[PDB]
PDB file of C-alpha atoms (C1' of nucleotides) in Angstrom:
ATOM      1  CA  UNK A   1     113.937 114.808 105.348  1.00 21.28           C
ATOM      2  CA  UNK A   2     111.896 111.777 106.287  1.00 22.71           C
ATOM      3  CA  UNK A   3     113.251 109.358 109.218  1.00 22.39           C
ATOM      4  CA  UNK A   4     114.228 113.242 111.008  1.00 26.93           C
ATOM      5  CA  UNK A   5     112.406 116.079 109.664  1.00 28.66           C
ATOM      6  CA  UNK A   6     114.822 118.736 108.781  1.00 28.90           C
ATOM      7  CA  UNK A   7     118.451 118.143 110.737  1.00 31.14           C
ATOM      8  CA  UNK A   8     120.083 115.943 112.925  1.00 31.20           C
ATOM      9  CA  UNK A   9     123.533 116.953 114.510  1.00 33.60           C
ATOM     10  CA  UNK A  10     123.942 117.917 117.994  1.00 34.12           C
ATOM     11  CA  UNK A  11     122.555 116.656 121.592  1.00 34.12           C
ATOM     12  CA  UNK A  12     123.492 113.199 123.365  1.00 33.27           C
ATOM     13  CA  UNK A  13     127.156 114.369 123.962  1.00 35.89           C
ATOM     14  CA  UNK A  14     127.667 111.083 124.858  1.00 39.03           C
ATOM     15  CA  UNK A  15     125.287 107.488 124.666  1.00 39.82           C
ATOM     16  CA  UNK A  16     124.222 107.804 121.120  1.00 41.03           C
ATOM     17  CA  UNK A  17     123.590 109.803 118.228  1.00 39.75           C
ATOM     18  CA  UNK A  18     122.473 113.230 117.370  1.00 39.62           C
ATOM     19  CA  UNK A  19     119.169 113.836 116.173  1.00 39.73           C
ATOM     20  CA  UNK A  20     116.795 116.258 116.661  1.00 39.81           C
ATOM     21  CA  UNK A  21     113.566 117.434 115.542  1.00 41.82           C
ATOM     22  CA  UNK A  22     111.903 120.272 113.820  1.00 40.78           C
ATOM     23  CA  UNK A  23     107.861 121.147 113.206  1.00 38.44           C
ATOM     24  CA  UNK A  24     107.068 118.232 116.250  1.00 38.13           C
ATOM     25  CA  UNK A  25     103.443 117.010 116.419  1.00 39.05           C
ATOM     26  CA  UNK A  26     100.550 118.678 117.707  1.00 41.66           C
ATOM     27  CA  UNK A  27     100.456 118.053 121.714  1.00 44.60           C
ATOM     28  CA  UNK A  28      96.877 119.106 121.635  1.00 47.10           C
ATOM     29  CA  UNK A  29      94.055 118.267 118.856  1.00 49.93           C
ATOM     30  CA  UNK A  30      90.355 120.216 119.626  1.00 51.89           C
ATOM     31  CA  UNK A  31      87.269 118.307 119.608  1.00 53.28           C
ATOM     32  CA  UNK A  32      86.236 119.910 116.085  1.00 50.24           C
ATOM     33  CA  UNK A  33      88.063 121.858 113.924  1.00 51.35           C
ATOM     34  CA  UNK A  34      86.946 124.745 111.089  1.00 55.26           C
ATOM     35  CA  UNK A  35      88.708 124.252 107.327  1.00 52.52           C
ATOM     36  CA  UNK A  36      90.276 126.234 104.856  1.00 50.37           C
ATOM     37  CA  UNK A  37      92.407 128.829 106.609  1.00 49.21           C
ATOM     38  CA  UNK A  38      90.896 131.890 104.671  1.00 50.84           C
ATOM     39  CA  UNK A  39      93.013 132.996 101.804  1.00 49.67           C
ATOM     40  CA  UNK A  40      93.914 135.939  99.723  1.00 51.00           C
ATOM     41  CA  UNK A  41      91.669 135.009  96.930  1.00 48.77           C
ATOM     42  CA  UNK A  42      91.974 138.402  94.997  1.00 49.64           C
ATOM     43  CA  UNK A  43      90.850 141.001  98.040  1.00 52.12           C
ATOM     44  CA  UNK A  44      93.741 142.805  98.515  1.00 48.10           C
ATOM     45  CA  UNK A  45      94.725 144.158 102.285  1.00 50.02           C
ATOM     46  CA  UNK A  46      94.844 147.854 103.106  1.00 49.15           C
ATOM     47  CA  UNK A  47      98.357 147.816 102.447  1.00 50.64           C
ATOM     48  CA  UNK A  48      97.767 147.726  99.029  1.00 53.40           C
ATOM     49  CA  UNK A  49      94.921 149.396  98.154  1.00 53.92           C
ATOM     50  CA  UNK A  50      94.550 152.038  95.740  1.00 52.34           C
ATOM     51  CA  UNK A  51      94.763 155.849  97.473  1.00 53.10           C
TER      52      UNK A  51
ATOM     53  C1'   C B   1     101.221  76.567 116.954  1.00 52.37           C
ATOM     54  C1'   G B   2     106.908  76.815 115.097  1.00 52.84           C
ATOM     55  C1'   G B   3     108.644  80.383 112.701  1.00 51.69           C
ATOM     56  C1'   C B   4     108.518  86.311 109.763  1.00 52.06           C
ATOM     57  C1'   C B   5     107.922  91.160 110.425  1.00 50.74           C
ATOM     58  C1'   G B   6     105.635  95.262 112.768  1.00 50.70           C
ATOM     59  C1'   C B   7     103.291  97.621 117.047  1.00 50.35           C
ATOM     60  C1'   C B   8     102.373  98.593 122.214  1.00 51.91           C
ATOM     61  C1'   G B   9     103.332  98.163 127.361  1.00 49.82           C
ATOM     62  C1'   C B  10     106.776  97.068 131.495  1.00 52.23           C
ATOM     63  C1'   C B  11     112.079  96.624 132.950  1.00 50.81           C
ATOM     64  C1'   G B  12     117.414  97.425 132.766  1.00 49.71           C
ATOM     65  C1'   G B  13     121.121 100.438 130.397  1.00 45.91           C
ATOM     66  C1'   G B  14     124.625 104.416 128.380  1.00 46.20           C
ATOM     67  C1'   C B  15     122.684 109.476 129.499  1.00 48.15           C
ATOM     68  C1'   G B  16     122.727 116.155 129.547  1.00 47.90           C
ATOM     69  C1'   C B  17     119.954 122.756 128.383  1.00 51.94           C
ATOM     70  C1'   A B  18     121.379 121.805 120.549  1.00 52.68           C
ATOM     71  C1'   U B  19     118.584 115.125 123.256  1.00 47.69           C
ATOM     72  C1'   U B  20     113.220 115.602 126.557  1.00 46.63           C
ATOM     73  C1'   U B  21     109.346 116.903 129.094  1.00 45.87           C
ATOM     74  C1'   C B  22     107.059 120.691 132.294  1.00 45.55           C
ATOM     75  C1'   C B  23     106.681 125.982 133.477  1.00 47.44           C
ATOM     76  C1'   A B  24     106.561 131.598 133.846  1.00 47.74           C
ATOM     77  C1'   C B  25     107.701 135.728 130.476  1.00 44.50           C
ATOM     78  C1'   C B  26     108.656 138.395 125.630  1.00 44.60           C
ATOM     79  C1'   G B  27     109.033 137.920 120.609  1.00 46.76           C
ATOM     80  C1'   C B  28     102.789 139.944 120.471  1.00 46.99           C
ATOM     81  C1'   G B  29     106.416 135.569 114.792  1.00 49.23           C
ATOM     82  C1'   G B  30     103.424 131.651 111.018  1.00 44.71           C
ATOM     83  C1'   C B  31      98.267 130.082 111.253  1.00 43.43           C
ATOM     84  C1'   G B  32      92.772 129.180 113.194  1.00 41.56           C
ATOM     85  C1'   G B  33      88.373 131.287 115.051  1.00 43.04           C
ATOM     86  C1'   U B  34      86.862 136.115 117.821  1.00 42.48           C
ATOM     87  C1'   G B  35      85.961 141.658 119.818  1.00 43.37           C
ATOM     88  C1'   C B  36      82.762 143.799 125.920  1.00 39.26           C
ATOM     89  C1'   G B  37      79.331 147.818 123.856  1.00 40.89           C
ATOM     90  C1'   C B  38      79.124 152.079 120.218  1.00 40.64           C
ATOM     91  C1'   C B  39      81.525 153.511 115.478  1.00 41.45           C
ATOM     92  C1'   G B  40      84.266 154.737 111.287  1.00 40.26           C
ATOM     93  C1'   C B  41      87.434 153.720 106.721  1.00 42.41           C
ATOM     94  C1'   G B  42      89.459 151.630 101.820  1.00 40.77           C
ATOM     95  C1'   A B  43      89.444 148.452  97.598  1.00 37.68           C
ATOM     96  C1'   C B  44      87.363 144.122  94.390  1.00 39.18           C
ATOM     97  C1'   C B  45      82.184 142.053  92.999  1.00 37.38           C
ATOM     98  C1'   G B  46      76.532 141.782  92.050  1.00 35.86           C
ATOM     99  C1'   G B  47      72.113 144.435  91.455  1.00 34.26           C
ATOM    100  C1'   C B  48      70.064 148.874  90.155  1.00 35.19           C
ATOM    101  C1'   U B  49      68.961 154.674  89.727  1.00 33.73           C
ATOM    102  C1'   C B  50      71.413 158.699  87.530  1.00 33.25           C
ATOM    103  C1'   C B  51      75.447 162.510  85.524  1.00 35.16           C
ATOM    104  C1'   G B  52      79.354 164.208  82.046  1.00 34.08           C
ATOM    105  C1'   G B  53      82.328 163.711  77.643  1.00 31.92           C
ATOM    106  C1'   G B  54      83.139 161.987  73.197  1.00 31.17           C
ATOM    107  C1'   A B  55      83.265 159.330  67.991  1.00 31.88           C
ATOM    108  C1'   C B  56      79.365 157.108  63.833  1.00 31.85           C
ATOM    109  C1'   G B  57      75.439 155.173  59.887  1.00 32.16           C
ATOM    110  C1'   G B  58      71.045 156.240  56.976  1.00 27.67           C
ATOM    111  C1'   C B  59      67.344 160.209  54.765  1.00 31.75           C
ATOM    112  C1'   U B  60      65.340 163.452  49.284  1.00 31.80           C
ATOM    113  C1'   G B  61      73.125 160.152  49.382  1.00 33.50           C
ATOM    114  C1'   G B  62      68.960 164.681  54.552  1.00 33.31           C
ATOM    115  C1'   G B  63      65.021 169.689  54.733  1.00 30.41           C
ATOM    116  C1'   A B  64      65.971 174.532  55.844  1.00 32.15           C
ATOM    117  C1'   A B  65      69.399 178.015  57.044  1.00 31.98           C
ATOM    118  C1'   G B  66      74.458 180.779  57.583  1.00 34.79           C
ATOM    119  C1'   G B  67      78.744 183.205  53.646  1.00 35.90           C
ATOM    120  C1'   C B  68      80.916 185.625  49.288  1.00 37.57           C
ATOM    121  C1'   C B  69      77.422 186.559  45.043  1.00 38.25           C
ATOM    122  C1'   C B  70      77.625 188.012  39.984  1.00 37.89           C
ATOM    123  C1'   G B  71      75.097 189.004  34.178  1.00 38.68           C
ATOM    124  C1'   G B  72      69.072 188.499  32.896  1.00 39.87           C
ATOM    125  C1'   C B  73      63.536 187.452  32.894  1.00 39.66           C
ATOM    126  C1'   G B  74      59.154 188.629  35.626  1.00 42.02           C
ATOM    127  C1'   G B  75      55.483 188.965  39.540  1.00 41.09           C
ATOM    128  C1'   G B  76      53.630 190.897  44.226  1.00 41.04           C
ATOM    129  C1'   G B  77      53.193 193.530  49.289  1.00 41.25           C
ATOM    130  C1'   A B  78      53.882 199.058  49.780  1.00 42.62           C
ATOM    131  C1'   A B  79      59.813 203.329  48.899  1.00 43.66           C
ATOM    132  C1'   G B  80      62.869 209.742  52.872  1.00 46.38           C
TER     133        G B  80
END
RNA sequence: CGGCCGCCGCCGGGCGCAUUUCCACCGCGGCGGUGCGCCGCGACCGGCUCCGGGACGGCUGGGAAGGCCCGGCGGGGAAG
C-alpha cells in the first residue's frame, strides 16, 4: 500500500525478502509539460452518438 | 563539538528472469501532445435568418355571414 505499492511476495529466492514493485517512477521527466489530460466533459465520442 | 535521527556517496556481503537494469519486437493497452498535403462525417453549445404544426384571451362578452325557418305589418327596384 505505502512502504511497497501494491504486492510484495516473490523474487530473492534466497538473501532476503520478497518485494516487488508496481506503477515504478518515471525514468524520464520532459523539460515542460502541458496540463489537464483533456476529458469527457459532456461531448460524447462517435460511439455514442445519436444515428 | 559529544550525542539524536534522517539523507547521500563509496566499500564489503548474501544474491537470480516474479528481485534489477539495459535492449529489440508485439500487445498498437492506460495517458499526453500531433498528422506530410488534400478532404469528408456525427453529436452537444452560442449567435442569427427562416419553415411547418398546433392550443388561447379580449371586442359591441366580437361585426358580418352559413343552416332549418315559421304566423304578421309595410316599403322599394322591376315578375314567363
Amino acid at each position: 500500500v505505502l512502504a511497497t505499492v501494491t504486492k510484495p511476495v516473490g523474487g530473492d529466492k534466497n538473501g532476503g525478502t520478497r518485494v516487488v514493485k508496481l506503477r515504478k517512477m518515471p525514468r524520464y521527466y520532459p523539460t515542460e509539460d502541458v496540463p489537464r489530460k483533456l476529458l469527457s466533459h459532456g461531448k460524447k465520442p462517435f460511439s455514442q452518438h445519436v444515428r
